[PDB]
C-alpha cells in the first residue's frame, strides 16, 4: 500500500518535573528544574551526586505490587507513561483490530539497576539467590512485551536500542510501520533509569557528567560558556501514533501529524560529534526532504542539547549549515537544561514537548543560559518561554555510535 | 511497488566455527558445538555447558586497544559484520555511504562487561569503573563501531527483541532497502551471554537444560527427554541490497529476501501459547508479505529451542499454517547442533536457510532419538537431507511473545 499519514492521538510521561504530561509541560513553561541531590543511594564516593530523579512515582497507580516487584524500574516507568498515552488515546482495543495495533518502546540500557542488585546476590551470596524474574524483568524488549501482554496488542511488537537517540528512532520506525501499512496504531517512545552506581560510577568515568554538586538546579546549561557535561535523569515518554484516516474515522482528538523522519550516522567517534555537526545536518535535511518541506518553515526546534562542550555547539554549527540565513529567524531550546538527560527516554519526552510547543504555539526555554558560548548567536530561548507562531517543530537526537535521529511534526486542522 | 532485497554477503561466529563456511560444514556434519564452559566456574550454577566461540582472535579485525574498549558481544558483532561486507564485495563510496546502514542487534547485550565492571564497583568502588563501560557495553556499539570503522551513513540503529532480535534486525533491514531509506544493510545479531547473569539468570527460570553428563545431547528439539534450551555465543551479520544495485556491480547473490513477518503472542512474558497462534499469524504475515501460497514453503528452519511449550507451539503453528503441506516440507532446528544464540539465533538461522537454498539441502535436527507426542513431521531427524529447497523460512519467537519470521527464495 501507498505511503499514509501519521497523527499523534495519545501522549503520557514519566519525567523529574512531574508524573504525567500536563505537570511536566507546566513545568517546561514555567523554566522549572527537576534536577536534585540524589536521595535513594549513598553517592559520597562519586563526583556527581544529583540527578532527575522521578519525584513519588507509585507504580500501584498502573500494576498490582506483586507484578511491579518483578520489574526493572525502566519497565516500571515505560508501562507508566505507554499506558498513560494509550488511555489519552481514547483507543479501544478490540478482536477486529489488535493485530493492527503494536508497540515500540526502547531504552539505552535498561535494567541497569535490576543488573547491579542481580550481580551483588550473585557475588556476595552464589547464583542461587539471582531472581527468576532477572531476564525477563530486565532486558529491553519487555516493556513492549508487557505492554502487549496488559493490553493485548498483536501487531508488530519490538524495541529499539541506539543509546541518547532510542525515544526519536523508536518513534520514527514505528511511524514507518504505519506509513507501510504493517500497523495502524503503535505505542512509542522509550524509558530509562540509569541512575545505580554502574550508570552514574559508569557516565562519571568517562568525564561526561557534570560535577556541579553545589548548585544542581544550574548543572544543565546547554550552550552556557561553563556546561561541563549532562545531567543524568530518569523516567519515559510514550506517543500512541496512528494512520490519519484511522484517527478521523473513530473521531480521534488529534495533537499534531509527523512528516518528517531523519536518521544518520557521523560514522566519525563512539562518544563525540563532528565539531561541524555533519551528522546531524545530514540527519535533518533528511528528515526536512522526509517531510516535503522548505527549510523556512521549521519555526522551533528541540535541541538534543545535552550541556557538553563538543555536543551543543556541533548542533549550532549544524542548524546553521541546514538552515542558513533562517538559523536566525527560528527558535532553539533544550528543555534539558530543565529536565537533564533522560537518555534513552530523551528522545520521547521531547517529541511530546515538541508536540505541545504546537499545541500551545510557545517555544519552551533553554534555563541557565547565562553566557552563550562563541557562536552561539541564534534564538536559544534563554531563561523564559517565548509564545510563538510554530507550524513546524523539529526534534532532534544524537547518541554514542554517531546515531542521528530528527523527528518533523506539524500542526494539524 | 516496493524494490527487491537479496543477499549478497554473510559472515558467522558460531560454536561451529569461526565463520560461515566452517559453521555450515558442522551443521550438514551434524556435529555439535556444545561442551561444558572453560572460561569460568560454574560449581555453583545448575548448567555448566553450552556453545562457546572456541579461538576468536579479535586482532584479525580491531586493534588489542579497541578490542579492550568492547564487550565480546560487540567484538563478535563486528567480526561477523566485517566478514559480511568482505564476502560481499561492496565498495563504500563518497557517492553511496549515505546509502549504506547497519542494524545489528543483541537480547541481552553486555552482560559479561556489566558483570567485570560490578565487581570492580562491589570491590574497590566507582573510581575502578572503565570509562569505556558505558560506550563498551550498550547494544547498538556494533552499529556505531561498523559505521565509524566502514564509514556508513545510513540508517544507523540496534533492535533488541530478546530470542527474536537476529531476525527482526534482518526483516527490518530490508523494509529500508524496499522502501527506498538505503540501498544496501549490515543486518543481524551477536550475543555473549556465558557470565554468571546469563547462565545464572535463564538457570534461575529453569529455562535451561540441565544435563551436564552429556552436553552434546542436551540441545533435543521435539525430542520426549528435553529440558530446556543451550545457551550459545556468536554472530551473524548479512549484507542486504538492493537488487538493481547488485547486479550494477555484478554481485554473488545467494538467495532473495521476499517476506518478512512480525507478531505478538500478547500472551505471557516466557511461555507460547501451547497451539502457537502468535507464530501461525506471524508466518502467515511473512507469506502475505512474499505473495507466497503456504504450499511454496519447502524447509522451515524452526526457532526449535528444546523446550517441552515452546518445540509444541511450533509444531502446531505449522500443522495450523501448512495444513496438508506439513507433511511435505521439511523443518529442523539447527538449535539442535548450534544450541541457542538468543539475540543472535535468528541472524545464524537466516544463514543456515540461505544456505539451505544454495545447496538443496535441509540441515539435521540432531538428538531427536524419540520424537514426542504430534510431533510427526519431517523434522530432518539426525542426518542432514539433500532435497529441492526454492523457498525457507526462518522463525524465531522471543521473551514478551514477540515474533519474526523470514522467507527466502532462490534468485534465478
Ligand atoms: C556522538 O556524541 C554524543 C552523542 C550523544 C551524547 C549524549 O549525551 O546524548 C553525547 C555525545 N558526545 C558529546 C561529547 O556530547
Ligand atoms: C514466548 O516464549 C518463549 C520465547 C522464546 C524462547 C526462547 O528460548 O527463545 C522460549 C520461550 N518459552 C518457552 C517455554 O519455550
Not at 568525564?207 to 549532562?230: H, I, K, Q, V
Not at 534513552?344 to 533553554?366: C, M, Y
Request: proline fraction near 4%; glycine fraction near 12%; charged fraction near 20%.
Amino acid at each position: 500500500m501507498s505511503r499514509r499519514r501519521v497523527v499523534i492521538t495519545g501522549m503520557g510521561m514519566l519525567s523529574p518535573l512531574g508524573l504525567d504530561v500536563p505537570s511536566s509541560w507546566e513545568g517546561i513553561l514555567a523554566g522549572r528544574s527537576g534536577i536534585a541531590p540524589i536521595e535513594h543511594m549513598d553517592l559520597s564516593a562519586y563526583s556527581t551526586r544529583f540527578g532527575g530523579s522521578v519525584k513519588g512515582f507509585n507504580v500501584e497507580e498502573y500494576l498490582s505490587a506483586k507484578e511491579a516487584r518483578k520489574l526493572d524500574l525502566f519497565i516500571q516507568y515505560g508501562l507508566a507513561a505507554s499506558f498513560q498515552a494509550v488511555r489519552d488515546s481514547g483507543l479501544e482495543v478490540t478482536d477486529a483490530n489488535r493485530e493492527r495495533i503494536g508497540v515500540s518502546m526502547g531504552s539505552g540500557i535498561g535494567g541497569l539497576t535490576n543488573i547491579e542488585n542481580n550481580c551483588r546476590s550473585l557475588f556476595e551470596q552464589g547464583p542461587r539467590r539471582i531472581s527468576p524474574f532477572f531476564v525477563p524483568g530486565s532486558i529491553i524488549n519487555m516493556v513492549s512485551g508487557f505492554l502487549s501482554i496488559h493490553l493485548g496488542l498483536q501487531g508488530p511488537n519490538y524495541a529499539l536500542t541506539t543509546a541518547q537517540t532510542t525515544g526519536t528512532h523508536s518513534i520514527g520506525m514505528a511511524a514507518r510501520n504505519i506509513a507501510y501499512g504493517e500497523a495502524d496504531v503503535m505505542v512509542a517512545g522509550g524509558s530509562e533509569m540509569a541512575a545505580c552506581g554502574l550508570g552514574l560510577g559508569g557516565f562519571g568515568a568517562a568525564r561526561a557528567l557534570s560535577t556541579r554538586n553545589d548548585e544542581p538546579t544550574r548543572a544543565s546549561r546547554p550552550w552556557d560558556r561553563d556546561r561541563d557535561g549532562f545531567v543524568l535523569s530518569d523516567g519515559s515518554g510514550a506517543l500512541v501514533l496512528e494512520e490519519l484516516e484511522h484517527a478521523r474515522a473513530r473521531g480521534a482528538r488529534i495533537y499534531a501529524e509527523l512528516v518528517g523522519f531523519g536518521m544518520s550516522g557521523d560514522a566519525f567517534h563512539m562518544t563525540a560529534p563532528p565539531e561541524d555537526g555533519a551528522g546531524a545536518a545530514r540527519c535533518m535535511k533528511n528528515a526536512l526532504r522526509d517531510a516535503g518541506l522548505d527549510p523556512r518553515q521549521v519555526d522551533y526546534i528541540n535541541a538534543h542539547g545535552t550541556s557538553t562542550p563538543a555536543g551543543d555547539i556541533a548542533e549550532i554549527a549544524a542548524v546553521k549549515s541546514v538552515f542558513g540565513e533562517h538559523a536566525h529567524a527560528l527558535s532553539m531550546s533544550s528543555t534539558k537544561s530543565m529536565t537533564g538527560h533522560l537518555l534513552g527516554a530523551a528522545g520521547a519526552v521531547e517529541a511530546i514537548f515538541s508536540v505541545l510547543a504546537l499545541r500551545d504555539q510557545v517555544a519552551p526555554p533553554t534555563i541557565n543560559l547565562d553566557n552563550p558560548d562563541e557562536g552561539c548567536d541564534l534564538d536559544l530561548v534563554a531563561h523564559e518561554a517565548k509564545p510563538r507562531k510554530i507550524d513546524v517543530a523539529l526534534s532532534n537526537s544524537f547518541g554514542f555510535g554517531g546515531t542521528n535521529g530528527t523527528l518533523v511534526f506539524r500542526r494539524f486542522a
